[PDB]
Amino acid sequence: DQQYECVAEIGEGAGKVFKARDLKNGGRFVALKRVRPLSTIREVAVLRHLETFEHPNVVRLFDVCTKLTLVFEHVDQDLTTYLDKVPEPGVPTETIKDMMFQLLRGLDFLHSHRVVHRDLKPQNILVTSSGQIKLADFGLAVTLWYRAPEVLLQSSYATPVDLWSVGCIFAEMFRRKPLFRGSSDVDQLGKILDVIGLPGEEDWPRDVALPRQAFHKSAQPIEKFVTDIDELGKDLLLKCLTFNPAKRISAYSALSHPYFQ
Numbered sequence: 001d002q003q004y005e006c007v008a009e010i011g012e013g014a015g016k017v018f019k020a021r022d023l024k025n026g027g028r029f030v031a032l033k034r035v036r037p038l039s040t041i042r043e044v045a046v047l048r049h050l051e052t053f054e055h056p057n058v059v060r061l062f063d064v065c066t067k068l069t070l071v072f073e074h075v076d077q078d079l080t081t082y083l084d085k086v087p088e089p090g091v092p093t094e095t096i097k098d099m100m101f102q103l104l105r106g107l108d109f110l111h112s113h114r115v116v117h118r119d120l121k122p123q124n125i126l127v128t129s130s131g132q133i134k135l136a137d138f139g140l141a142v143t144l145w146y147r148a149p150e151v152l153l154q155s156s157y158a159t160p161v162d163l164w165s166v167g168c169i170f171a172e173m174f175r176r177k178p179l180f181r182g183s184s185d186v187d188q189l190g191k192i193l194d195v196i197g198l199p200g201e202e203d204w205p206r207d208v209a210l211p212r213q214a215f216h217k218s219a220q221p222i223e224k225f226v227t228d229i230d231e232l233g234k235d236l237l238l239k240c241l242t243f244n245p246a247k248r249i250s251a252y253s254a255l256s257h258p259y260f261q
């Protein structure tokens with residue numbers, strides 16, 4: 001509108017997003033998303049609705065302009081930039097524990113309200129100037145490195161999908177480099193099972209193009225790929241990376257794990 005001025009282009013991908021000046025509000029930076037049905041009306045309704053709770057761990061939605069313009073609070077950087085710029089030998093064991101918790105709270109908040117992010121990844125996990133985690137880019141219908149097994153197999157899309165991503169990110173906090181870096185759904189599923197090993201035959205979803213036989217792999221020691229992690233972080237991380245989504249830990253169960261005590 002005539003109340004916002006675009007200064008740059010933050011990101012673009014699956015309209016796009018800009019960094020803008022909130023002229024009416026002290027010229028603060030904001031994030032303008034210009035999207036381009038009833039389902040959309042409803043997704044927007046959901047966003048407006050979740051906004052009312054102003055969960056500390058999700059980006060504030062400052063306004064919706066009547067194709068569609070959504071105005072969100074701006075955060076200087078994302079988790080990737082944060083990991084890129086983090087000084088050796090990495091991220092403070094305790095900074096990890098903290099961010100992860102904040103990550104799980106925002107996630108449980110969405111799950112409690114039955115929203116499934118579906119594309120959780122460092123690029124849409126924003127770290128604020130005060131070290132606070134804020135989720136963005138969800139609620140509105142390139143990299144499979146964070147995709148969950150079921151998504152890849154194309155069988156279920158429940159909320160467990162995001163916990164898988166969380167574990168994938170939890171590892172990367174330490175690694176500072178992606179855990180499962182595949183180049184195709186099959187390749188991706190391949191590298192995953194290389195590490196967690198083949199799941200029981202009954203843990204394999206029924207009626208999916210890819211059969212368990214399509215792969216050939218044993219459970220490798222996790223601390224091998226994730227160095228510094230403790231006994232507790234190891235347990236939790238595994239509980240997140242369980243092949244069967246029905247056995248995968250929930251953000252809510254996660255918020256209580258010993259690791260956070």
Ligand SMILES: CC(C)c1n[nH]c(Cl)c1-c1ccnc(Nc2ccc(N3CCNCC3)cn2)n1
Nearest residue numbers: 010011017031072073074075078123124136137
């Ligand atoms: C996750 C991004 C793409 C996003 N999608 N939808 C909305 Cl809404 C936002 C959003 C909201 C608030 N703040 C930022 N902040 C931000 C994030 C990344 C970057 N960058 C720029 C430098 N290269 C890495 C990416 C700059 N600002 N983004």
